Design an enzyme around this catalytic site. Structure first.
Site, PDB file in Angstrom:
ATOM      1  N   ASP A 144      -5.211   3.798  -6.971  1.00  0.00           N
ATOM      2  CA  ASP A 144      -6.046   3.948  -6.058  1.00  0.00           C
ATOM      3  C   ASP A 144      -6.950   5.342  -6.177  1.00  0.00           C
ATOM      4  O   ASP A 144      -6.707   6.129  -7.100  1.00  0.00           O
ATOM      5  CB  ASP A 144      -5.386   3.688  -4.787  1.00  0.00           C
ATOM      6  CG  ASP A 144      -6.348   3.195  -3.821  1.00  0.00           C
ATOM      7  OD1 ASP A 144      -7.537   3.021  -4.026  1.00  0.00           O
ATOM      8  OD2 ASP A 144      -5.917   2.676  -2.704  1.00  0.00           O
TER       9      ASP A 144
ATOM     10  N   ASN B 192     -18.420   4.187 -11.582  1.00  0.00           N
ATOM     11  CA  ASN B 192     -18.097   3.435 -12.838  1.00  0.00           C
ATOM     12  C   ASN B 192     -18.425   1.990 -12.088  1.00  0.00           C
ATOM     13  O   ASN B 192     -18.717   1.162 -13.300  1.00  0.00           O
ATOM     14  CB  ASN B 192     -16.701   3.846 -13.158  1.00  0.00           C
ATOM     15  CG  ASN B 192     -16.504   4.480 -14.340  1.00  0.00           C
ATOM     16  OD1 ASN B 192     -17.153   4.265 -15.433  1.00  0.00           O
ATOM     17  ND2 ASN B 192     -15.833   5.945 -14.130  1.00  0.00           N
TER      18      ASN B 192
ATOM     19  N   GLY C 137     -20.506   0.542 -10.367  1.00  0.00           N
ATOM     20  CA  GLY C 137     -21.874   0.244 -10.102  1.00  0.00           C
ATOM     21  C   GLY C 137     -22.405   0.151 -11.373  1.00  0.00           C
ATOM     22  O   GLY C 137     -23.218  -0.744 -12.008  1.00  0.00           O
TER      23      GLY C 137
ATOM     24  N   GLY D 200     -25.417   3.002  -5.294  1.00  0.00           N
ATOM     25  CA  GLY D 200     -24.145   3.459  -5.337  1.00  0.00           C
ATOM     26  C   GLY D 200     -23.909   3.331  -7.055  1.00  0.00           C
ATOM     27  O   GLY D 200     -23.638   2.042  -7.280  1.00  0.00           O
TER      28      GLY D 200
ATOM     29  N   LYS E 220       0.878  -1.195   0.023  1.00  0.00           N
ATOM     30  CA  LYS E 220      -0.009  -0.037   0.068  1.00  0.00           C
ATOM     31  C   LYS E 220       0.764   1.143   0.020  1.00  0.00           C
ATOM     32  O   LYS E 220       1.763   1.365   0.876  1.00  0.00           O
ATOM     33  CB  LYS E 220      -0.833   0.087   1.154  1.00  0.00           C
ATOM     34  CG  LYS E 220      -2.196   0.933   1.018  1.00  0.00           C
ATOM     35  CD  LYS E 220      -3.042   0.174  -0.303  1.00  0.00           C
ATOM     36  CE  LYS E 220      -3.702   1.056  -0.862  1.00  0.00           C
ATOM     37  NZ  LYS E 220      -4.782   0.426  -2.064  1.00  0.00           N
TER      38      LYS E 220
END
Ligand code: NAP
Length: 416
Positions: free
Chosen positions: A142, A219, A221, A216, A102
């Site tokens: 991210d 993009n 969804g 929601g 991360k």
């Protein structure tokens, strides 16, 4: 701190349901590598501004670490560490040869210009080069990071490495022109659809002409709804963002829904349908339900009100553990969040494989391989769910932690 402690608590709740040694648990609690660096850039006004960047490699027992980069002004070391622990299980559940990574920078990119964003990306790579690499640590897109930033960082890493190795492979999410791969934009939704029909197959009920409700409508969804309609033959009956919602039992089309959203500026007021609220949508009686919005929408306040047989947690942590348990005791099958959204990670791994080997697949090949891996991961999770008589999310945690612990034991890191 709240996020890292929450991740540790989740790991402990996983560990109480599987045979794990105490030393392995303590080893997993402390991330292997944390790199906090000062990233300097020269602003357009000529001044030099320094930000704080974090690079947390939670583990690399199963392989090179994999993880996204967040450019958020609220970024903290604890958040990055918790999300690295998250990505460890994310890559473990779907049998990737990856560890958890991360990246992040404490920066608000809203006021950063294109030149400043490019400089920040290149300077972050210059700071964290010694702890990244194609075979060690692969950054991925991210929040507030777009593939243009990743083109920039891949260019910087290639410049530093002097072209000596497979530069494309150092990071993923790259543009198609430079070492990119097909299906990156629809990766998470496609993996969610794979998990959805696998859940339907496990339940023994087909998906020919049944109902899906998505809450929601970003993009992910929109792509989830469109792919569900195109492949599964299901009928989308409701779509909503955090602003408003749409109701149409007769059937909808996500394409015209997104077009209406782009035209009006909001998804509500769709022709031939009723404006509705998100809250009653979360409790709507459908066959498949997918929360694709801000975290923790399904709560104990309304957990018993969900009637959908399959709940696909496309978003990360859209259901609180108490609501998870309530849905479990209601006979509701829940696809755990990190298993459901692992499509982006799997497609990122595919991009890494394509970059490493210098050979790039076609869209159909990527889709087939993603389907195969998602089906295998979902069936492993479901089988653990059945055998151990534990929650589906609990099963996914068990299988991921078991894989990581096996990798450690085979590496000799933990003797017991
Ligand atoms: N690897 C790649 O090549 C690649 C390419 C693109 C994206 N990605 C990844 O996939 C993600 C998608 O990128 P993006 O450009 O769509 O990010 P984005 O600019 O945040 O757009 C996401 C969309 O979701 C909607 N949304 C966000 N929060 C919401 C909420 N709580 N409720 C309802 N709707 C919400 C937003 O619309 P509203 O603000 O109107 O709600 C927005 O249009 C990114 O985070 C990125 O990391 C990867």
């Amino acid at each position: 701190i709240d996020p890292f402690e929450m991740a540790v608590k989740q790991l402990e709740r996983a560990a109480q349901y599987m045979d794990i040694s105490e030393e392995a648990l303590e080893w997993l609690k402390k991330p292997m590598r944390i790199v906090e660096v000062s990233v300097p850039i020269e602003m357009d006004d000529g001044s030099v501004k320094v930000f704080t960047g974090f690079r947390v490699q939670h583990n690399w027992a199963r392989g090179p670490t994999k993880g996204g980069i967040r450019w958020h002004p609220a970024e903290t070391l604890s958040t990055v560490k918790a999300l690295a622990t998250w990505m460890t299980w994310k890559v473990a559940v779907v049998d990737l040869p990856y560890g958890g990574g991360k990246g992040g920078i404490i920066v608000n990119p809203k006021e950063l210009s294109e030149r400043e964003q490019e400089r920040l990306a290149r300077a972050y790579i210059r700071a964290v080069y010694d702890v990244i690499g194609p075979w060690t640590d692969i950054p991925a897109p991210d929040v507030y990071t777009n593939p243009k930033i990743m083109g920039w960082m891949m260019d910087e890493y290639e410049t530093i490495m002097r072209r000596k190795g497979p530069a494309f492979g150092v990071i993923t999410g790259k543009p198609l022109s430079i070492g990119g791969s097909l299906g990156r934009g629809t990766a998470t939704a496609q993996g969610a659809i794979f998990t959805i029909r696998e859940a339907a197959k496990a339940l023994g009920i087909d998906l020919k002409g049944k109902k899906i409700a998505v809450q929601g409508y970003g993009n992910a969804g929109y792509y989830t709804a469109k792919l569900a309609k195109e492949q599964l033959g299901m009928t989308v009956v409701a779509v909503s963002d955090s602003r408003g919602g749409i109701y149409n039992p007769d059937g909808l089309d996500p394409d015209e829904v997104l077009k209406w959203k782009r035209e009006h500026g909001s998804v509500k007021d769709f022709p031939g349908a009723t404006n509705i609220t998100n809250e009653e949508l979360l409790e709507l009686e459908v066959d498949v339900l997918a929360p694709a919005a801000i975290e923790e929408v399904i709560t104990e306040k309304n957990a018993d009100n969900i009637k959908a047989k399959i709940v696909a947690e496309v978003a990360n942590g859209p259901v609180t553990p108490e609501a998870d348990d309530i849905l479990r005791e209601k006979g509701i099958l829940q696809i755990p969040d990190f298993l459901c959204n692992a499509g982006g990670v799997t497609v990122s791994y595919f991009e890494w494989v394509q970059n490493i080997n210098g050979y790039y697949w076609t869209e159909e090949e990527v889709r087939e391989k993603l389907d195969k891996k998602m089906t295998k991961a979902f069936w492993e999770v479901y089988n653990t769910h059945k055998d151990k008589n534990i929650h589906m999310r609990d099963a996914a945690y068990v299988v991921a932690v078991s894989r990581v612990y096996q990798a450690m034991k085979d590496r000799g890191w933990v003797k017991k």
